[PDB]
Design a protein around this ligand. Structure first.
Ligand SMILES: [Zn+2]
Length: 146
């Protein structure tokens, strides 16, 4: 098992859970290991009250964006779908506030890293919001692109 060579990107994801699912790394680590992986695939989880919990070691290869696990940080927001199972940007004010300082901290310490939304690189709606519009205007809108 080993550490990454470089950190070209910080990817943002959601856990694809509903509002009522107040979960964190204890549960998502358990869910990922029942699916056959060795640990939680994300380096950071932001719970719905804004608590950021650490997953994999900040410097290790994780499993969150395939073909990119070798050179990136994966950050996960708890939420992402409504009760119908559709993608929905239902993240809390407090989650978005913690996310924005974690990312300013991360972009600063990983010289040259770029900030990315999983849906830019894979056919998925994850993280369920338009990353550029929230990073720039502080507007949260439900989206499969951006
Ligand atoms: Zn994702």
């Amino acid at each position: 098992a080993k550490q990454r060579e470089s950190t070209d990107a910080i990817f943002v994801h959601c856990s694809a859970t509903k509002p009522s699912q107040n979960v964190g790394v204890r549960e998502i680590r358990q869910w990922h290991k029942e699916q056959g992986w060795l640990d939680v695939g994300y380096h950071f989880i932001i719970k719905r009250d804004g608590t950021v919990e650490a997953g994999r070691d900040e410097m290790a290869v994780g499993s969150h964006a395939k073909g990119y696990n070798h050179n990136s940080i994966g950050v996960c927001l708890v939420g992402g779908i409504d009760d119908k199972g559709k993608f929905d940007a239902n993240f809390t004010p407090a989650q978005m506030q913690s996310l924005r300082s974690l990312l300013v901290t991360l972009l600063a310490k990983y010289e040259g890293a770029v900030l990315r939304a999983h849906h830019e690189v894979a056919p998925k709606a994850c993280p369920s919001f338009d990353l550029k519009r929230w990073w720039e205007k502080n507007e949260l809108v439900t989206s499969d692109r951006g």
